[PDB]
Design a protein around this ligand. Structure first.
Ligand SMILES: Nc1ncnc2c1ncn2[C@@H]1O[C@H](CSCC[C@H](N)C(=O)O)[C@@H](O)[C@H]1O
Ligand SMILES: Nc1ncnc2c1ncn2[C@@H]1O[C@H](CSCC[C@H](N)C(=O)O)[C@@H](O)[C@H]1O
Ligand SMILES: Nc1nc2cc(O)ccc2[nH]1
Ligand SMILES: Nc1nc2cc(O)ccc2[nH]1
Lengths: 257, 268
């Protein structure tokens, strides 16, 4: 935990969302794969509502691109002030924001509605109402009188839980905690590392609980979800970069029942 | 009558043509705004993309007639031709294309056009791939004069005859009158093999446009005039569609009232 105090957002982005992992040109890369699960899922039309919460956003937005066209009130979160400040730099188009434009374009490409990436970024920036602090370790992760409309119609979290959880059970509880934020019938789209144990973010060196596809499945069931979709991307050699030791990436579409 | 005087007036006026001012006037926003699907930019890209998408327009070689400082007209095309020749009358335009080819920062940025084409061709291509291909397939940039009977010169580089021709806002913009236009059309048509295809785009009912200092003169033409010239030069007209310029895209850089797109195949 205290490890996250040393977490450098620029180094995290550089490590994961700049080339080689950040190169979206090759359709066999992790980035293209991630956007596709997101897009495909929403394209079904079955994940819809008015409000949505992104759990542990860090300093990234890609995870909301296809999503933002289906929910008018979007709430983003993270445990670190630094990250929240970085999200705001891109939301307010302030100086030194991160360049998500490749990711916007590709989302537009994948969705195939002939939308221009500028329109896409405009819509995201418009629907994100607030950026709130959060701790998944708390049975009320948002706090008491959170400005966020609860319960949310749907939830999105990527590379969070397993990254803030020392072991399998703390993972399971964190999932339970957030699940409380989700209106019954609501949907959860969860993405994360498979069989990862550590990863760097500058001077920070975070520990991770190595999970598996089955382990992730079981957890979702245990938390009270019907698992609608669960897919795995195996990390190609050339995307093993020594910023971490992730072996694969998983995507789950889960429905609170 | 006499072609020389008119042709000389043209050549004279174009010595004042400023490529940057031209680029800004027509390919920066509001005209350059690709976000609105009702815009001219999107309509043009869509005409090209849909056309090549039939798969009916292919081969080894292609020539772009009066490229000017622009490449957007080749984005959907370059996936279908190994060898592409670009051409323009003015050297300063040829140099402008040179900058883009060398991928210099000084160059004009077409990335929005590349992105949008990729977007409409629907193959999830990334724009950098599309651009890298175009630069790969442009085998030369040649001087051209459509008023000569051999618009490229004699014994010129271009592999002739070409399997297809592309030309956008060229003919009507260098032709003082309909007869000149027609002749220019016949001259370039000698570069196209029989059975080959011509994709033609240009202004409808336009008489002038600005390119910096240069306020140039254009022969206003209509859809039907364009149709007839094609028939006259020996083309079956496969498709001819018209875009009516929206009030808010009529910005005083010209007096264009519409834009025409012609897919025509040379009888052979
Ligand atoms: N106790 C906690 N509760 C919620 N998030 C936490 C947390 N402790 C750390 N985090 C955050 O978990 C994030 C993991 S990195 C994930 C970034 C982004 N979702 C992406 O898809 O890349 C970090 O931003 C980190 O600050
Ligand atoms: N006699 C001639 N023969 C062929 N092209 C000529 C010409 N005289 C002028 N031109 C060129 O005609 C161009 C018209 S502007 C069109 C540029 C580009 N094709 C577009 O799509 O915007 C100018 O670049 C000009 O140099
Ligand atoms: N922690 C973390 N590991 C990752 C691996 C990826 O391939 C993409 C995003 C990531 N985030
Ligand atoms: N000359 C010229 N006129 C034009 C009109 C347009 O709408 C787009 C490009 C052009 N080029």
């Amino acid at each position: 935990a205290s490890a996250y105090q040393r977490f450098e957002p620029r180094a995290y982005l550089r490590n994961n969302y700049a080339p080689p992992r950040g190169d979206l040109c090759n359709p066999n890369g992790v980035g293209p794969w991630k956007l596709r699960c997101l897009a495909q899922t929403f394209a079904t039309g079955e994940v819809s509502g008015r409000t949505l919460i992104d759990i542990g956003s860090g300093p990234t937005v890609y995870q909301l691109l296809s999503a933002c066209s289906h929910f008018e009130d979007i709430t983003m979160t993270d445990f670190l002030e630094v990250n929240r400040q970085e999200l705001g730099r891109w939301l307010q188009e302030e100086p030194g924001a991160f360049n998500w434009s490749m990711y916007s374009q590709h989302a537009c490409l994948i969705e195939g509605k002939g939308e221009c990436w500028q329109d896409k970024e405009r819509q995201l920036r418009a629907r994100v109402k607030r950026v709130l602090p959060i701790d998944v370790h708390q049975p009320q992760p948002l706090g008491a009188g959170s400005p966020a409309p609860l319960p949310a119609d749907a939830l999105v979290s990527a590379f969070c839980l397993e990254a803030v959880s020392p072991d399998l059970a703390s993972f399971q509880r964190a999932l339970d905690h957030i699940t409380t934020l989700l209106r019954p019938g609501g949907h959860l789209l969860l993405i994360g590392a498979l069989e990862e144990s550590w990863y760097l973010a500058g001077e920070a060196r975070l520990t991770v609980v190595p999970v598996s596809e089955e382990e992730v499945r079981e957890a979702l069931v245990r938390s009270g979800y019907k698992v609608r979709d669960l897919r795995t991307y195996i990390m190609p050699a050339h995307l093993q970069t020594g910023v971490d030791d992730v072996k694969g990436v998983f995507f789950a579409w889960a429905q609170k029942v």
